From Swiss-Prot, chain A:
It comes from Homo sapiens. This is Proteasome subunit alpha type-4. Component of the 20S core proteasome complex involved in the proteolytic degradation of most intracellular proteins. This complex plays numerous essential roles within the cell by associating with different regulatory particles. Associated with two 19S regulatory particles, forms the 26S proteasome and thus participates in the ATP-dependent degradation of ubiquitinated proteins. The gene is PSMA4. Induction: Down-regulated by antioxidants BO-653 and probucol. The 26S proteasome consists of a 20S proteasome core and two 19S regulatory subunits. The 20S proteasome core is a barrel-shaped complex made of 28 subunits that are arranged in four stacked rings. The two outer rings are each formed by seven alpha subunits, and the two inner rings are formed by seven beta subunits. The proteolytic activity is exerted by three beta-subunits PSMB5, PSMB6 and PSMB7.
From Swiss-Prot, chain B:
It holds the Pfam family Proteasome_A_N. This is Proteasome subunit alpha type-1. The gene is PSMA1. The 26S proteasome consists of a 20S proteasome core and two 19S regulatory subunits. The 20S proteasome core is a barrel-shaped complex made of 28 subunits that are arranged in four stacked rings. The two outer rings are each formed by seven alpha subunits, and the two inner rings are formed by seven beta subunits. The proteolytic activity is exerted by three beta-subunits PSMB5, PSMB6 and PSMB7. Interacts with NOTCH3. Interacts with ZFAND1. One of its GO terms (molecular function) is lipopolysaccharide binding. InterPro entries: Ntn_hydrolases_N, Proteasome_alpha, Proteasome_alpha-type, Proteasome_alpha1, Proteasome_asu_N, Proteasome_sua/b.
Curated annotation (Swiss-Prot), chain D:
Belongs to the peptidase T1B family. This is Proteasome subunit beta type-5. Its main location: cytoplasm. It comes from Homo sapiens (Human). One of its GO terms (molecular function) is peptidase activity. The chain holds residues 60 to 260 of 263 of the full protein. It catalyses: Cleavage of peptide bonds with very broad specificity. The active site is at residue 1. The gene is PSMB5.
Curated annotation (Swiss-Prot), chain H:
The gene is PSMA7. The lineage of its organism: Eukaryota, Metazoa, Chordata, Craniata, Vertebrata. GO terms for cellular component: cytoplasm; cytosol; extracellular exosome; nucleoplasm; nucleus; proteasome complex; proteasome core complex; proteasome core complex, alpha-subunit complex. This is Proteasome subunit alpha type-7. Keywords: Acetylation, Cytoplasm, Glycoprotein, Host-virus interaction, Nucleus, Phosphoprotein, Proteasome. Glycans are attached at residue 129. GO terms for molecular function: identical protein binding.
Length: 250, 238, 213, 201, 199, 204, 232, 239, 228
């Protein structure tokens, strides 16, 4: 019985631990999600993977999950492990609301989940979750926020982050084109279509290959809007009109 | 050898080695000898020490007013069964208000120690109990083993270098069922001088004697009151 | 319905001396209006220097006696000595409290010698409070025996009375006289008087008959 | 049963009687109702004599474990808070306990009052027992913060004497302690029948 | 059995209670305090039986302090009062229910001052003024007689003065002293321990 | 009794393509008011309300457990809840406390979201649902409210006359009750807008 | 006794859950099965060959109803299928005892797939070896879903599972469109199972179940011979 | 229930998983803490931020109470769950014994939470080390550290993380009595040590002091520029 | 490759009990001497760094007013056994109203010392000395990771154990005095430690029949050093 155990919890003699680094190796492939904010609003741009010609395209989204009444998350990695984490922090926000009668701040929802995710890396003799995921949202203490989780269990606030297959190619270009607090939610939409033009090897940016959802603050609404496939392609060609002018004039 | 790791795994010959290795633990402890007359039961132990300033490790323990034991093996497992031993004697005295019989006590020990010799990740109890007591049927000398197989006997000896003590008892056991307590003890003391190297024997600080008796409660004698028993022995012939 | 308690009578008495201790009790077990037996003493010898007396519900007095005798043997196998008189009294105070919400209906008096060879008498409530005294009585006729020993042993309410310590000879005839007075007026007072004397030598015993109404 | 305690400039004075009854029958005259938790803490006995004896012996166990781990003595505020929490777990089950906790502390004198119901209050003067209301009247007249030592001995001694005179369940002898800087000191133990000849003339 | 009061203004909350710790027929302590801080702008005023007022109200206090250390910022007065209501109502249908009556007072930087009301059955009520105890039957009728939503804190104290003078006219208990607080944008402030000299 | 410890009254009435719901405003303890703005009607999505009456603890407790289960329903599924489905949800919630029951009696009123059709029902304190077509009432002053609605209800009523009927039904029945009053709030919903009015009642 | 309480499904150094990869190979070695939704109902069809003439083909069934309006087929191994059928039978009942409403087909796949994910992570178990095809007509519009042993699920218009599924999906791509009736979908579902069957396709070599707005039902072998007639 | 011994003895008398976890401490960012007589000073080095992103969620100097600060090294996932378990015990101590928590008490709680955790079944040991800095009652500034095996251990100056023994060798040749004379003089003692470590050019340093009566107060990168100016200018005039 | 934690040797002893005996050869050395006048008991500290505070570490710690201790090997798991010994003496005082003797403290700890397994996880890697004065006079005991305890007269435990035990058998006799038994032990510690002996590298504690457990400090300690 101790001959069949795989010991998914112990250290390695070099100090680190192997089991979550293999999971953070699997988080490298299989998906692309990114977020950006500088002003009123925050967006999630995700790239669809299964683009086969026989699917129904239902459930209002594919990788976007509405968590609270005023925050949502984009996910990446093992999709079966993703569904269990989503409906786990979905009722953390409700048992907060049951206890305090107030919507949950966006930061301490992330810390609650990342303590559950950390415990599997630490005891129990258990496979960890191969899931990293973003967080957008709004609260009255700091406004629009943007977070990133890791399978190790540590989080962080950000302004622009991708966890794609060429995420390191995207982050090196995000910190070449930005402005702190002045990118409104049209330049951010224009910058989002430019970044995933690069990191997607499939060229020409088919409007069904991506998903974009925005979170804008209306007075007592905090409207989370998954924008439809009729206004994506006009935003695609708007990138395509200026790039022919910017190349030829240089 | 892959058949030599756990208590569960049988050998292809049919001999579980983890039981047989616990028999090596009782061969490491110092010797002790028990024997009985018609009306008495005497067990004699041989203490050891580490340095000349540290005290000697005692072996004979008092279980009840009519039951005493002698240990050989690792002492922490001995106290784990001794606390079980005391507990099973006084609750029968709590319920039935009578001394628990000796032959019925040991059957509880054999059922207690057989359980970890069949589960997974459970060691056997490495201990070597010699038991002396009284039923209504007179004296009894019992031995146990880590293989949970207890033996009824009239004289035994266990511990390191005990085969020489058994050869002394076989050629003198015709006399044991007649003599009184005086030369019953110094029959057993002549067994412990057999199991020693040829220069030191019995210097009144490494020997202990216990007697349960037909009108005598079980009594342990230590290193001052041994001196009446220990005198009157001849020199070692050489 | 089923009442778990009944009163079985009984009367015990202790007197601590300078170098002795006397524990006495009657020998009648009885409940209701009837008699069970005319021979049931309460002198229980724990050690050779300690005698306990147990009055009250007899089904608890049998159980509590056997719990204590198990725990002296657990002491000796773990400490290689016997319990003193003051160590038994502290132990039994935690035994009686351990059934706080279903108590024993037992009155207890422990009499024996201390470490200096002097008398010691401890007296309990049914819950487990105690103190050390010179003399206590317990049971049914305790309210009759306690004022008399306040006059003779305590030297209370007397003017120009000398203070001689209790000899053993005076204390024996004092115990033998005070149970005769309690046999006349109490109906639970027995037929034989079991007196136990704890000295430096050992525990003596003595039986004195009474009237048998 | 009558106990009292009051603190002043020179420490804390504790006093109590010694009669323990049973219905109308008097069990004993020599019951020590001020038990000694530590060389630096004192506790009284009020209500259930066995319940105050147990849980304050159990408190003395707990304060000793605190001293070995932390290498200083426990405060008077912390000691009563432990006693208030142990008793609360048996609330409604019928415990009788009305004790007081006395002792010198790093903040000066300490005098708290703990009930079996869960009351834990501070104060300067207290009086607990069946004849406690007889003790308050005489104690409120002669109380001052700036009393002398021999004057404060006479106040607490006579205050018990008036309570045993009116109450039927109070009597015996008058025990008297004094909590000081270094620790408590036993002052005296006077019989009431001797005080009757003293306080008359 | 004993009394406290809840006058709430446009930008302040004026609370006050008595100082008497009672017994059988005597009073044990004359300077008791019914007032429990949790944050820099939230008080708590608990009334009930003996053991439950101290231990429940400091159980709340260790959870409000813990929320601030885990997050850096404090609870609102609304969420703090709505957290206490959950703790009675869960512990109500149990073997040991708490029997306490309380009212909570707080100030917030967003919605200003706030006052809440509870009982031993855990019902919340956002009220402009409230009171517990048997003196609430005497003193609520003076208070709605003279209450203005735009009342200044200087005349709110003399409204409290009038509301307590009548309590020593037709009420059989003693109640000599009263401790007063005030909560505003700058936090808790002690006012004068108003009383009536019984000499 | 236990239901008369705080009082309360909730009425719902069905109109043509609309449904109105009304309740009192008093919060009090057996003789004594405390405040006159106690909420007893809670929103459950658009065009669908619920009214609670009974013990004031379980009014605030059940309305938070029900909201807890409702938000998890509308996020696990992608749609709003039907009016008939919520009736089965509440009846599950009360019946779990079969022997520890909540002392409240809910009243549910709302429009069906796809085909805008009214719906009213009421439940006892252990969850026996009863759907009607005219009116449901709950609270302490129930018998006064039956004499109103049996004599004033009409089958097909525009939202103007529906408001006038449920107002005169509440202002006269609650006025005859002692532990209910101190104001009446009236919600009247329909497929295009929603209307909340407060009536001029006796503060007596 | 007790269990093992340790996961025997770990991450490879290449980042692939190997046991889930091996469980999909058992799915690919199963019997072929196709499923097509067309605008008023969904057609499920499977392929059932007995090994000899001794078997009673009318004893067990591949096509199983879950409720009044939800059917379910598989392509994998036999005894693992009957476990999560009985599990899915019960999950439709705890939904109905709460809400008094038949369960939507989307919400059933939420709960069947959550079993299989929970079953591929817990201690001392190997994952399932089946894939599923789930049909149903909830609120007019029909539905067609497909799970896997990993625990994911999809929403297909038409698909094929089992042997030669990569040839079945190319065949459906050149045949299926948006506008077909139910009985037109039946004729193109037998035409795609004929791509991999044996020589004779009788009325008992296949098994077809359909959904309508009238609910899920399973075809008797009488009219299955009628659809098998005038085929190819 | 996963019951399995994880940390067992070696053939020479060591514990493998304990000495492996100390290496993971040795590759976190360097934290340096000293103490004075009235004010304590501690500050992590190697901030290493992306310098276009958020920074108030990356903090590694937190507060257990009003009087207890805490810095750490090692991996941050195991670190902040130790803090949340220490924030509960220091609050439950207040519901008991009335004083605020002494700094010696809270370090025994963290060490005893960590020793029993190398002793239990199915649990890898913690991979963090900490510095617990505080001013107790009667105003006595002192600090401690915590090994991953659970040996709390007081100091007068300390430095853990990657590049610690180089700094710890530098601290003993530099810590004198007169270096704890002024409050700002003790700050440059830390700033000279961190500049003698992984890069720490004023942008990766983040110090935080405590004057025994306040909360923890982080100086913005304006005094860290001002102190590094006057420390390097004092080196440019002596050399 | 991997055995269990509960496996016998072919020679028959165990593996990890025998491995824990090797672990106590890495701790600091400790010497205790039983004398009829009283028990003296000393240790070194093994100061690593100049910046280290010296008094924060300790090896002598008391169990009761009349029982001291001394630890070696690992230190972090010694604090578990010390806390079990403190609670055990208070439960004995609570129920019996007396002081638990020095021997019966030791077997209460030794029964705990071998209880690891895979139910209800490794042996303790410490070694202890118990100095105390019960009613049989002054006593000195020494337990093991194996759970074996025996009364010694002069026991030396630590990394320099067998080097000190040879030099301790030649100076001890049954009629020592406590003033010279203290001086005799510091000569042995002066030979075996690395650094030079001062008032900070070591500490002592004695227990007498008259007074309670007393631990020396840096004022009354260095008179023995300068008069060595």
């Amino acid at each position: 019985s101790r001959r069949y155990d795989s010991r998914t919890t112990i250290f390695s003699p070099e100090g680190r631990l192997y089991q979550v680094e293999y999971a953070m190796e699997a988080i490298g492939h299989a998906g692309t999600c990114l977020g950006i904010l500088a002003n009123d609003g925050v967006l999630l741009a995700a790239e669809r993977r299964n683009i086969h010609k026989l699917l129904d395209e239902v459930f209002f989204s594919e990788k976007i999950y509405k968590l609270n009444e005023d925050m949502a998350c984009s996910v990446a990695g093992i999709t079966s492990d993703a569904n269990v984490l989503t409906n786990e922090l979905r009722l953390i926000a409700q048992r907060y609301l049951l206890q305090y009668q107030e919507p949950i701040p966006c930061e301490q929802l992330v810390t609650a989940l990342c303590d559950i995710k950390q415990a599997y890396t630490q005891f129990g003799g258990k496979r960890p979750f191969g899931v990293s995921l973003l967080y957008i949202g709004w609260d009255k203490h700091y406004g629009f926020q943007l977070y990133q989780s890791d399978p190790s269990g540590n989080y962080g606030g950000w302004k622009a982050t991708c966890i794609g297959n060429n995420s390191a190619a995207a982050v090196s270009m995000l910190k070449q084109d930005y402005k702190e607090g002045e990118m409104t939610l049209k330049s951010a939409l224009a910058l989002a279509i430019k970044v995933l033009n690069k990191t997607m090897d499939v060229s020409k940016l088919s409007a069904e290959k991506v998903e974009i959802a925005t979170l804008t603050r209306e007075n007592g609404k905090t409207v989370i809007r998954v924008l439809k496939q009729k206004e994506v392609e006009q935003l695609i060609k708007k990138h395509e009109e200026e790039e022919a002018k910017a190349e030829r004039e240089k | 050898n892959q058949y030599d790791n756990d208590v569960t795994v049988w050998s292809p010959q049919g001999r579980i080695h983890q039981i047989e290795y616990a028999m090596e633990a009782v061969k490491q402890g110092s010797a002790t000898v028990g024997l009985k007359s018609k009306t008495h039961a005497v067990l004699v132990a041989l203490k050891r020490a580490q340095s000349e300033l540290a005290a000697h490790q005692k072996k004979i323990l008092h279980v009840d007013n009519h039951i005493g034991i002698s240990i050989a093996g690792l002492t922490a497992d001995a106290r784990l069964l001794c606390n079980f031993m005391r507990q099973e004697c006084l609750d029968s005295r709590f319920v039935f208000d009578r001394p628990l019989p000796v032959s019925r006590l040991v059957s509880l020990i054999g059922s207690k120690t057989q359980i970890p010799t069949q589960r997974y990740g459970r060691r056997p109890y490495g201990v070597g109990l010699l038991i002396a007591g009284y039923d209504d049927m007179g004296p009894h000398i019992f031995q146990t083993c880590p293989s949970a197989n207890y033996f009824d006997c009239r004289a035994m000896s266990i511990g390191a270098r005990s085969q020489s003590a058994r050869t002394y008892l076989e050629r003198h056991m015709s006399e044991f069922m007649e003599c009184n307590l005086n030369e019953l003890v110094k029959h057993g003391l002549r067994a412990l001088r057999e199991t020693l190297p040829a220069e030191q024997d019995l210097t009144t600080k490494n020997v202990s004697i216990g007697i349960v008796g037909k009108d005598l409660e079980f009594t342990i004698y230590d290193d001052d009151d041994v001196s009446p028993f220990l005198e009157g022995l001849e020199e070692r012939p050489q | 319905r089923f009442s778990p308690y009944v009163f079985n009578g009984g009367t015990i008495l202790a007197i601590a001396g300078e170098d002795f201790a006397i524990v006495a009790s009657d020998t009648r077990l009885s409940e209701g209006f009837s008699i069970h037996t005319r021979d049931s003493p309460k002198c229980y010898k724990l050690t050779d220097k300690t005698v306990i007396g147990c009055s009250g519900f007899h089904g608890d007095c049998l159980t509590l006696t056997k719990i204590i005798e198990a725990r002296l043997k657990m002491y000796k196998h773990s400490n290689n000595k016997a319990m003193t008189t003051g160590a038994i009294a502290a132990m039994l105070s935690t035994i009686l409290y351990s059934r706080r919400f279903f108590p024993y209906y037992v009155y207890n008096i422990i009499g024996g010698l201390d470490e200096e060879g002097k008398g010691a008498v401890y007296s309990f409530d049914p819950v487990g409070s105690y103190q050390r005294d010179s003399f206590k009585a317990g049971g049914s006729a305790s309210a009759m025996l306690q004022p008399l020993l306040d006059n003779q042993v305590g030297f209370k309410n007397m003017q120009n009375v000398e203070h001689v310590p209790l000899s053993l000879d005076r204390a024996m005839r004092l115990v033998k006289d005070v149970f005769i007075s309690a046999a006349e007026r109490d109906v639970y007072t027995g037929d034989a008087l079991r007196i136990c004397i704890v000295t430096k030598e050992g525990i003596r015993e003595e039986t004195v008959s009474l009237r048998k109404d | 049963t009558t106990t009292l305690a009051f603190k002043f400039r020179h420490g804390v004075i504790v006093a109590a009687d010694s009669r323990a009854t049973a219905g109308a029958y008097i069990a004993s005259q020599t019951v020590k109702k001020v038990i000694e938790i530590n060389p630096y803490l004192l506790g009284t006995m009020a209500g259930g004599a066995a319940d105050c004896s147990f849980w304050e012996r159990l408190l003395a166990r707990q304060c000793r474990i605190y001293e070995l781990r932390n290498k200083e003595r426990i405060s008077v505020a912390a000691a009563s808070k432990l006693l208030a929490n142990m008793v609360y777990q048996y609330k409604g089950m019928g415990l009788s306990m009305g004790t007081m906790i006395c002792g010198w502390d790093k903040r000066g004198p300490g005098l708290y009052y703990v009930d079996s119901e869960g009351n834990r209050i501070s104060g300067a003067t207290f009086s607990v027992g069946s004849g406690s209301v007889y003790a308050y009247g005489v104690m409120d007249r002669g109380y001052s913060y700036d009393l002398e030592v021999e004057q404060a001995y006479d106040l607490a001694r006579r205050a018990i004497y008036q309570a045993t005179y009116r109450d039927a369940y109070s009597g015996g002898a008058v025990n008297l302690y004094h909590v000081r800087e270094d620790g408590w000191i036993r002052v005296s133990s006077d019989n009431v029948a001797d005080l009757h000849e003293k306080y008359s003339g | 059995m004993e009394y406290l009061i809840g006058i709430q203004g446009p930008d302040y909350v004026l609370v006050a209670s008595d100082r008497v710790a009672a017994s059988n027929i005597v009073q044990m302590k004359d300077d008791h305090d019914k007032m429990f801080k949790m944050s820099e702008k939230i008080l708590l005023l608990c009334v009930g039986e003996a053991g439950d007022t101290v231990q429940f109200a400091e159980y709340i206090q260790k959870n409000v302090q813990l929320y601030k250390m885990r997050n850096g910022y404090e609870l609102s007065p609304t969420a703090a009062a709505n957290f206490t209501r959950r703790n009675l109502a869960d512990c109500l249908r149990s073997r040991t229910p708490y029997h306490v009556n309380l009212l909570l007072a707080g100030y917030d930087e967003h919605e200003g001052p706030a006052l809440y009301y509870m009982d031993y059955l855990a019902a919340l009520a956002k009220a402009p003024f409230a009171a517990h105890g048997y003196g609430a039957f005497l003193t609520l009728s003076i208070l709605d007689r003279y209450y203005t939503p735009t009342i200044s804190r200087e005349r709110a104290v003399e409204l409290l003065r009038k509301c307590l003078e009548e309590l020593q006219k037709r009420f059989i208990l003693n109640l000599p002293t009263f401790s007063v607080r005030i909560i505003d944008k700058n936090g808790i402030h002690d006012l004068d321990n108003i009383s009536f000299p019984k000499q | 009794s236990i239901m008369s410890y705080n009082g309360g009254a909730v009425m719902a009435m069905k109109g043509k393509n609309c449904v109105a719901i009304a309740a009192d405003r008093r919060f009090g303890i057996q003789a004594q008011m405390v405040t006159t703005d106690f909420q007893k009607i809670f929103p459950m999505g658009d065009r669908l309300y619920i009214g609670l009456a009974g013990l004031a603890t379980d009014v605030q407790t059940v309305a938070q457990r029900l909201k807890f289960r409702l938000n998890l329903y509308e996020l696990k599924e992608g749609r709003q809840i039907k009016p008939y489905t919520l009736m089965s949800m509440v009846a599950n919630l009360l019946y779990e406390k079969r022997f520890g029951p909540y002392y409240t009696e809910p009243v549910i009123a709302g429009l069906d979201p796809k085909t805008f059709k009214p719906f009213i029902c009421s439940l006892d304190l252990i969850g026996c649902p009863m759907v009607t077509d005219d009116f449901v009432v709950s609270g302490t002053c129930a018998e006064q409210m039956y004499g109103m609605c049996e004599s004033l209800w009409e089958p097909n009523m525009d939202p103007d006359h529906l408001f006038e009927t449920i107002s005169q039904a509440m202002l006269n029945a609650v006025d005859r009750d002692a532990v209910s009053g101190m104001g009446v709030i009236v919600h009247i919903i329909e497929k295009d807008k929603i209307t909340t009015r407060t009536l001029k009642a006796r503060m007596d | 006794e007790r269990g093992y309480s340790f996961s025997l499904t770990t991450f490879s150094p290449s980042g692939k859950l190997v046991q889930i990869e091996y469980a999909l190979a058992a799915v690919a070695g199963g019997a072929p099965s196709v499923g097509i939704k067309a605008a008023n109902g969904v057609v499920l069809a499977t392929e059932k060959k007995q090994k000899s003439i001794l078997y009673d083909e009318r004893s067990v069934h591949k096509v199983e109803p879950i409720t009044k309006h939800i059917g379910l087929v598989y392509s994998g191994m036999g005894p693992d299928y009957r476990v999560l059928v009985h599990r899915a039978r019960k999950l439709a009942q705890q939904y109905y005892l709460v809400y008094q409403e038949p369960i939507p087909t989307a919400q059933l796949v939420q709960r069947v797939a959550s079993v299989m994910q929970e079953y591929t992570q817990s201690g001392g178990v190997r994952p399932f070896g089946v894939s599923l095809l789930i049909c149903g007509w909830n609120e007019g519009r029909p539905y067609l879903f497909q799970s896997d042993p990993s625990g994911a699920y999809f929403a297909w218009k038409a698909t094929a599972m089992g042997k030669n599924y990569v040839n079945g999906k190319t065949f459906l791509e050149k045949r299926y469109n948006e506008d077909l009736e139910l009985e037109d979908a039946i004729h193109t579902a037998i035409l795609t199972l004929k791509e991999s069957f044996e020589g004779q396709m009788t009325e008992d070599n296949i098994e077809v179940g359909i959904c309508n707005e009238a609910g899920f039902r399973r075809l008797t072998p009488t009219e299955v011979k009628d659809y098998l007639a005038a085929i190819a | 229930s996963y019951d399995r011994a994880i940390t067992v003895f070696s053939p020479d008398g060591h514990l493998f998983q304990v000495e492996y976890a100390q290496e993971a401490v040795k590759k976190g960012s360097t934290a340096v803490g000293v103490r004075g007589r009235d004010i304590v000073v501690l500050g992590v080095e190697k901030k290493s931020v992306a310098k276009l992103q958020d920074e108030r969620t990356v903090r590694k100097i937190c507060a257990l109470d009003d009087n207890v600060c805490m810095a750490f090294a090692g991996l941050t996932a195991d670190a902040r769950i130790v803090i949340n378990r220490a924030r509960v015990e220091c609050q439950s101590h207040r519901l008991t014994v009335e004083d605020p928590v002494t700094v010696e008490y809270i370090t025994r709680y963290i060490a005893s939470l960590k020793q029993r955790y190398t002793q239990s079944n199915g649990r890898r040991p913690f991979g963090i080390s900490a510095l617990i800095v505080g001013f107790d009652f009667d105003g006595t500034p002192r600090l401690y550290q915590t090994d991953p095996s659970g040996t709390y251990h007081a100091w007068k100056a300390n430095a853990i993380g990657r590049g610690a023994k180089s700094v710890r060798e530098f601290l003993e040749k530099n810590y004198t009595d007169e270096a704890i004379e002024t409050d700002d003089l003790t700050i440059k003692l830390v700033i000279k040590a961190l500049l003698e470590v992984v890069q720490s050019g004023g942008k990766n340093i983040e110090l935080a002091v405590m004057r025994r009566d306040q909360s923890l107060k982080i100086l913005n990168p304006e005094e860290i520029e001002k102190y590094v100016a006057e420390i390097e200018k004092e080196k440019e005039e002596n050399e | 490759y991997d055995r269990g934690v509960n496996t016998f040797s072919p020679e028959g002893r165990l593996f990890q009990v025998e491995y824990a005996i090797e672990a106590i050869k890495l701790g600091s050395t400790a010497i205790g001497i039983q004398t009829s006048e009283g028990v003296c008991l000393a240790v070194e500290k093994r100061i690593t760094s100049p910046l280290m505070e010296p008094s924060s570490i300790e090896k002598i710690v008391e169990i009761d007013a009349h029982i001291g201790c001394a630890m070696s090997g690992l230190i972090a798991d010694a604090k578990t056994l010390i806390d079990k010994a403190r609670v055990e003496t208070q439960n004995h005082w609570f129920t019996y109203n007396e002081t638990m003797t020095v021997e019966s403290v030791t077997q209460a700890v030794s029964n705990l010392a071998l209880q690891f397994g895979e139910e209800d996880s490794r042996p303790f890697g410490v070694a202890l000395l118990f100095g105390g004065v019960d009613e049989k006079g002054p006593q000195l005991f020494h337990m093991d990771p194996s759970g074996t305890f025996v009364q010694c007269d002069a026991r030396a435990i630590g990394s320099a154990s067998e080097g000190a035990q040879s030099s301790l058998q030649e100076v001890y006799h049954k009629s020592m005095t406590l003033k010279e038994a203290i001086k005799s032990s510091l000569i042995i510690l002066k030979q075996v430690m690395e650094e030079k002996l001062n008032a900070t590298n070591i500490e002592l504690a004695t227990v007498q029949p008259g007074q309670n457990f007393h631990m020396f400090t840096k004022e009354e300690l260095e008179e023995v050093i300068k008069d060595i």
